């Protein structure tokens, strides 16, 4: 009587690690779930859980980008990544024998793998990023070579939608970025797992600002010496530093699963990235993105008044403190907090695709 | 409204790897979870969890009834300072612990908390033991000022009822809520030969964490020198032992250093092991013949419900391993006790439960 859920992701790390909550959730249901990926496959092993390297030695870097160094230009990109996939995800799920396939919007071989064996397939998105829906009819077509290749020339069984995100910042999407009809999941922020270190626990009434940008840049501590309160950077992984001097409320970490820290910081400074914005989302805590150039996340934040753009340059005390005082951010930001946690969480998400798959 | 579980367990991995499945199932809930633990604590973080090193410095080796309970007292002494440390700064409301992490009741007594026992299988069990360790820790107890009782105290069992009818009566775990047994032996990238072959049966070959160190792997030297007339792939998890203690074997017979146990077994016909009470309920799951090699009650369930059989270090050849393949009688009774055990509750059910205990 146990189902078997069949995990076919994008082999960037921030794919694969939004997919885990409700893969763990499966498990916990007595149900069985295995990966068919590539690349930062380690994450899904380090995750408990276990995977198959569809694509052995591949070397992904060259297949986003080959040549010397719109919408069709990206599709044919992550149809020829997807492609490098297709053999591995078949002989797996041939073998292994799912009753669902679950998949990331840009990994082709999933739905792929869903319509070779008459599976339905579940889309997981990182966030509101990637809900293009034509992303994965544009990217079909594009593989058309390899669904012909092994003769898939069926459609899957259904094809079911989850979000993770609330319904506020759904409503602040452009009109076809958004997606009706999908199944929402709460978003469980899930970043790795960690023997946490003692500095952790927040001191008595001091409040702490995270910074994470995920090569030289002191201009920012610069101004934030004169905000009263600490500052904890985060470095990102396999990452080395050199310390100069930095100012006294200026502590700086290797690395530290995100969900973990902000639960006791009181505000966060980072790049923008998806996985970022969602987990400080669901902290209930006030965001300061530092774009780069002239994307949707920047606008969320002004949208539902949760935070704010700053100018890597334009980066002082006068931001740090408008995310630490000003009213309405925290506000706006405990109420998009419990709007995530009124979402179902990963559990009862899990129990419905159960009773989907038969 | 995200409810709190601190996990205090004790510091062999053997302890850890069957409390995580509970702890992934209270996380899928929406709820927060977190360890409070020393020594093998990295498998804790290697199962995408959160933990804090309770006793960063310690040696345990040199750590390690009322003589056991005396023990085991030492070794959790060295983790209260820490438990509670956590604990009140992490403000839990709810402490899941292992029988003889004595740090456990403690923290739990000393926040008026419900504790949760969580056993690695029927083997650690042993209802009463915790009362003589909370005896034995008297000195730290009265240390920190803990006078009270915890708020209420749950034992899960992951023993299917079949097993437990097998056990003798003290032993056995009244009043305790069933929780299905699901194998956790830590995540892997899954090697290309784990698929099997054009209708080529398989027998796992195993001896646990360990137990195949310091020259445990020799005891198989018997066994494979006959395995080669048999018909089926045997594929062996060393996991730690020598191989050069073997030195040749048969091409039939497939080598590796680790694999996820619960992986493996569901592309076996038979198990082959030491009697570990994780490979046992493993292999339970798995609904698979069983063979044990004895080096106690385990031992006992195998012959008890029908489900396989004793087979002395020495004695252990093709015979066996053809009874395993072939007795239908083995291959029923297994299948029958995995029904069983799938019809215990999940974990994602006893998690649901524990929260509404801690409302
Ligand atoms: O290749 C391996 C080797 C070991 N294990 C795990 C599975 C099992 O859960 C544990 C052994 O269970 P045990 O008998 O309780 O461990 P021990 O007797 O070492 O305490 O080791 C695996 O999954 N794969």
Not at 223 to 234: G, K, N, P, R, Y
Request: charged share 20%; proline share 8%.
């Amino acid at each position: 009587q146990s189902m078997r859920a069949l995990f076919i992701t994008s082999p960037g790390l921030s794919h694969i690690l939004p997919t885990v909550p409700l893969a763990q959730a499966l498990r916990a249901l007595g149900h069985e779930v295995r990966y068919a990926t590539g690349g930062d496959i380690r994450a899904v092993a380090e995750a408990g859980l276990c995977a198959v390297d569809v694509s052995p030695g591949v070397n992904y870097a060259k297949l986003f980008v080959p040549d010397d160094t719109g919408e069709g230009f990206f599709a044919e990109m992550f149809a020829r990544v997807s492609a490098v996939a297709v053999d591995g995800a078949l002989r797996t799920a041939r073998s292994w024998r799912p009753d669902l396939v679950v998949h990331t919007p840009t990994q082709g071989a999933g739905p792929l793998t869903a319509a070779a064996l008459q599976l339905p397939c579940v889309e997981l998105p990182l966030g509101p990023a990637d809900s293009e829906p034509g992303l994965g009819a544009l990217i079909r077509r594009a593989m058309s070579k390899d669904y012909e290749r092994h003769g898939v020339t069926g459609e899957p069984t259904g094809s079911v939608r989850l979000t993770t995100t609330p319904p506020s910042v759904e409503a602040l999407l452009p009109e076809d970025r958004r997606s009706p009809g999908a199944w929402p999941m709460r978003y469980v922020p899930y970043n790795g797992g960690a023997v946490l270190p003692d500095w952790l626990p927040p001191a008595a009434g001091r409040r702490r600002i995270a910074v994470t940008l995920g090569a030289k840049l002191a201009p920012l501590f610069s101004e934030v010496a004169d905000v009263d309160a600490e500052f904890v950077l985060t470095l990102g992984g396999g990452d080395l530093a050199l310390l100069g001097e930095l100012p006294a409320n200026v502590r700086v970490v290797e690395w530290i699963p995100l969900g973990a820290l902000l639960e006791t910081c009181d505000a966060i400074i980072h790049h923008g990235g998806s996985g970022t914005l969602l987990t400080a989302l669901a902290a209930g805590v006030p965001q300061c993105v530092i774009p780069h150039g002239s994307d949707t996340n920047r606008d969320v934040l002004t949208g539902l008044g949760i935070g704010f753009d700053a100018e890597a340059g334009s980066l002082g005390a006068e931001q740090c403190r408008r995310l630490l005082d000003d009213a309405g951010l925290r506000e706006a930001a405990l109420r998009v907090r419990q709007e995530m946690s009124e979402m179902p969480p990963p559990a009862e998400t899990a129990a419905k695709l159960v009773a989907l798959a038969g």
